[PDB]
Design an enzyme around this catalytic site. Structure first.
Site, PDB file in Angstrom:
ATOM      1  N   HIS A 195     178.631  55.069  15.185  1.00 46.89           N
ATOM      2  CA  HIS A 195     178.640  53.877  14.311  1.00 46.89           C
ATOM      3  C   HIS A 195     177.224  53.548  13.830  1.00 46.89           C
ATOM      4  CE1 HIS A 195     182.093  53.456  17.042  1.00 46.89           C
ATOM      5  NE2 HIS A 195     181.215  53.373  18.025  1.00 46.89           N
ATOM      6  N   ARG A 215     182.987  48.313  29.198  1.00 46.84           N
ATOM      7  CA  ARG A 215     181.971  49.309  28.892  1.00 46.84           C
ATOM      8  C   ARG A 215     180.760  49.269  29.824  1.00 46.84           C
ATOM      9  NH1 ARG A 215     179.447  50.124  24.843  1.00 46.84           N
ATOM     10  NH2 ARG A 215     179.511  52.367  25.308  1.00 46.84           N
ATOM     11  N   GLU A 251     172.770  50.707  22.136  1.00 45.21           N
ATOM     12  CA  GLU A 251     173.645  50.191  23.178  1.00 45.21           C
ATOM     13  C   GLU A 251     172.801  49.925  24.416  1.00 45.21           C
ATOM     14  OE1 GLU A 251     176.251  49.164  22.402  1.00 45.21           O
ATOM     15  OE2 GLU A 251     177.205  50.343  20.775  1.00 45.21           O
ATOM     16  N   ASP A 306     174.056  55.354  19.565  1.00 41.91           N
ATOM     17  CA  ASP A 306     175.460  55.653  19.339  1.00 41.91           C
ATOM     18  C   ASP A 306     175.578  56.191  17.914  1.00 41.91           C
ATOM     19  OD1 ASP A 306     178.064  55.084  18.058  1.00 41.91           O
ATOM     20  OD2 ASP A 306     178.648  54.373  20.027  1.00 41.91           O
TER      21      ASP A 306
END
Lengths: 468, 84, 468, 84
Positions: free
Chosen positions: C430, C462, C434, C427
């Protein structure tokens, strides 16, 4: 002074403005122009034929003035300085003649044909000035001639109001002889014995007005129509000749038209294919712009130029085809109007072609049949008695006719009586006289010339208070 | 034997002024055809008035100066078999 | 036998009908035609420019066949019979290239500009017959080349389906490189050691279909539009150049039109007076027939001829004026359409003349302002970790990307885990991993590469059960 | 220090077949401009799929014969300050 003499002249039309009419003839032998007299005299069937010399027409000022067309003596059946006792002499041709042929005043025409003719002779008198002489022709203006040896004349084409552009053919001419005009023919040649003397024939005709001309043709027509009736024996022929050229006419038509249909289909095919061309250049210019539209919305590609160019190619290519279209169409119109106007001549022709037939065999239908002659017509009416042979009623002084006959055209023979109280009139119908009281006008009876014996008493019904 | 009868009077008093006969023309109708007057109903039957246009064609037969401005003229076509 | 070799040829477009594609190059030094490479290489701004060599289009049979545009090696940055270990070699220009510029398959274009390029090297193998050799280029047909010294080639203008009539200008070219076509550039020059050997560069491009072309331009446009947005800094300029010639255009118009209004008023005055003439001849012919109507009902008068003649004179005189009328009118039309179509250019012009202004100062309105560079764009996203530097999760075998990013254009970095049970994905937003269960696809949490320590627990919301 | 990340898998098992890094290009974004991919939201943020048209322009930098008919290829533009 007297007659304000003017510009000399030979044998032309000479408009003088009323005033007093003066003539100044420029001596010289007859010109070859006025020579038509020659072809005229050409031995024709007994009649009075002629030739239009000059023409008359809408002149100028609001006043009346005639034309003094004089011309040396070459018309006298034989001339010499004859005895004064004779005031009238013959002549083979009479010039000045208002003849209203087709529709105008023939300022002169050639009267000379198979028809006897006599004329006055005024003997001119001396005058103040040198070579001028009054030659008062009974019916019109005095006019003083001025003959001159010095052949210096007036060459300019006849004064305005008189165009020599007349259909110089040779035809016949009725009353119209001097009506309202002509009335002048008279050899004035009798000049003293020691002066501008010479055999001169002056004739003064009056320059008719537009109206009068009409007031003339009409009558001409009146009398033509009448005679026509009396003479069917020929009129039909005068009717046939009218149908001959009628068809002769319709033909020259059908022809000159076939020609039109000619130049028609001619400019068609031409202008037609001339157009087809344009379409083709246009199509291509068009199909070309399609071959490049793809580059249209591609402002920066160069191939966009091609497109732009084909645009302009076709625009022009179009407007060409435009005018080419106009041309063609117009052609197609005339092409049509033609093809149709032709069949017309075709129609018209037959109509005429036939009518001649209905005017050709109809000719014999009044030619073939038996007619009788003069001698007969003579026996149709008891011959009037000679005033001096009218017996037993005292003396008789003939009197102006006024009593309309019944058939024919002239009045009845009248003679005064009783010192002007009793009127008599020959009745050719039964062969006998007729009495009428003067004042009253009433019928007194029927007497017999040999004697004057009555044969019938007064009839109150019968009277003729119709004559002063 | 056709002849022309010419008579005239004063253009004002109407008085008989005179009359002269013409030579005989036998059966020569011609003179009439020059004047336009038809044979029919006119031979020995009528007294036409001489009109100017005519003088020139009549005069040739009358020892008389046809003064048509001073007199009135009239003409008749009389016809009698034989002489007279 | 094998590849049915055919007619020799130099460096042209060669439509072979699918079958097996055989090539027979007629040896000879590069022709001056294909010499455009020269002007091409012309030192331009860094990029990949090119030149349309040939053009492609609606060929013939309902079957697919490409063009084997081969052409000796003059594109290698330096060549020699290098070591077999290398299967890819650079080159300064790549020929065969389906580039769909304006709206069609550019059977070839000049790719050679400021942009590095490498290509495959297939080493040809011997064969049955004498000088034939299979040179299987990885992505397409085998093709057996047949180089020949005897310079007897095929002069006829390229086989039908390929017109050399291309806008031979020099411009740039996007993806479209070998899409659906090109995909062939590869030096096959590696012939054995004793044969028709020579440095040859063959490139096979597929002859796109009408649809596919569309199916190509579109995408070309797709990518153009996108980049355009990302690069307003320039696009406006690409927008200005679009307005420059736009006005340059509207001018050539206003001009070529002024010209039309020219030839307009020109053929007017001419055709106009040309008409006036006819009227006059007509009038007269008319007024003439009046000068003679009087003789009309006079069939036998001769003057009737005059009348008849004037009749015919005017008829013709009329029809002339007819066509003269057509001509004039048509003229008057074009004359108009012109005068109006001109003001149009006048209107159009201003519209454009201005718009350039609204596309010229608007250029600085995105030129003048400060933009930043690459180095910055680099710092916008935490850099992904090296698969082998991902610590504490066991071993990792990278896996096909499939997870659509949020902004940009590529997917997210994926790597398998737990012997294929646990999936991870970088990701960059940030800077953290994940986890997602294999079968399920549900989010297991966020770990840290250095260690593998969680930092956040499972979030049922998610998940990405969107990738096999 | 920009670099090109090239990874590939079997066009059937989807199995990871390999990955090779590229030389560093420092701040030379160029390579990206030849491919058309915009800098924005693509540096260190995305894994584009290598499309044929691209091979010819990528190959010049990977000692690997990009067999795009036997494998699937993907490329990422990773950039890190300094060396690595």
């Amino acid at each position: 002074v007297a007659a304000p003499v003017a510009f000399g002249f030979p044998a032309l039309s000479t408009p003088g403005a009323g005033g007093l009419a003066v003539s100044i003839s420029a001596g010289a032998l007859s010109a070859a122009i006025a020579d038509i007299m020659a072809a005229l005299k050409g031995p024709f069937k007994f009649g009075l034929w002629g030739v239009a010399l000059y023409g008359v027409l809408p002149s100028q000022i609001a006043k009346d003035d005639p034309n003094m067309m004089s011309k040396i003596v070459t018309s006298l059946p034989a001339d010499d300085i004859t005895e004064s006792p004779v005031s009238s002499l013959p002549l083979d041709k009479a010039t000045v003649n208002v003849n209203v042929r087709v529709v105008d005043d023939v300022k002169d025409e050639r009267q000379n044909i198979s028809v006897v003719s006599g004329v006055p002779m005024s003997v001119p008198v001396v005058d103040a000035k040198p070579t001028e002489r009054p030659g008062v022709f009974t019916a019109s203006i005095p006019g003083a001639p001025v003959l001159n040896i010095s052949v210096n004349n007036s060459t300019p084409a006849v004064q305005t109001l008189s165009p020599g552009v007349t259909n110089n053919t040779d035809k016949d001419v009725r009353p119209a002889f001097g009506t309202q005009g002509g009335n002048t023919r008279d050899a004035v040649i009798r000049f003293p014995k020691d002066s501008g003397h010479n055999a001169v024939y002056v004739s003064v005709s009056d320059v008719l007005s537009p109206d009068q001309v009409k007031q003339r043709q009409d009558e001409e027509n009146r009398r033509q129509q009448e005679w026509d009736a009396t003479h069917p024996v020929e009129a039909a022929e005068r009717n046939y000749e009218r149908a001959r050229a009628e068809l002769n006419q319709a033909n020259e038509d059908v022809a000159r038209n076939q020609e039109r249909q000619a130049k028609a289909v001619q400019v068609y095919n031409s202008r037609k294919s001339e157009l087809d061309a344009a379409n083709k250049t246009l199509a291509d210019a068009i199909a070309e712009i399609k071959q490049f539209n793809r580059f249209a919305h591609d402002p920066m590609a160069g191939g966009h130029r091609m497109w732009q160019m084909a645009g302009l190619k076709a625009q022009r290519a179009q407007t060409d085809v435009n005018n080419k279209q106009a041309a063609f169409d117009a052609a197609a119109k005339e092409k049509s109007d033609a093809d149709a106007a032709l069949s017309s001549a075709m129609e018209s022709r037959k109509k005429k072609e036939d009518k001649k037939r209905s005017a050709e065999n109809n000719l014999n239908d009044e030619k073939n049949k038996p007619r009788k002659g003069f001698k007969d017509y003579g026996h149709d009416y008891h011959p009037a008695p000679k005033t001096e042979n009218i017996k037993g009623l005292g003396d008789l002084k003939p009197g102006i006719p006024k009593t309309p006959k019944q058939n024919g055209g002239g009045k009845r023979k009248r003679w005064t009586g009783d010192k002007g109280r009793k009127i008599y009139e020959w009745d050719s119908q039964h062969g006998e006289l007729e009495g009428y009281r003067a004042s009253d006008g009433q019928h007194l009876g029927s007497f017999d010339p040999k004697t004057g014996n009555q044969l019938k008493g007064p009839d109150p019904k019968r009277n003729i208070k119709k004559y002063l | 034997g056709l002849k022309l009868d010419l008579t005239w009077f004063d253009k004002s008093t109407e008085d008989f002024k005179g009359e002269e006969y013409s030579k005989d023309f036998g059966d020569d109708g011609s003179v009439m055809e020059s004047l336009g007057v038809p044979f029919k109903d006119n031979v020995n039957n009528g007294c036409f008035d001489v009109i100017a246009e005519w003088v020139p064609l009549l005069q040739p037969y009358f020892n008389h100066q046809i003064d048509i401005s001073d007199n009135e003229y009239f003409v008749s076509f009389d016809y009698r078999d034989g002489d007279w």
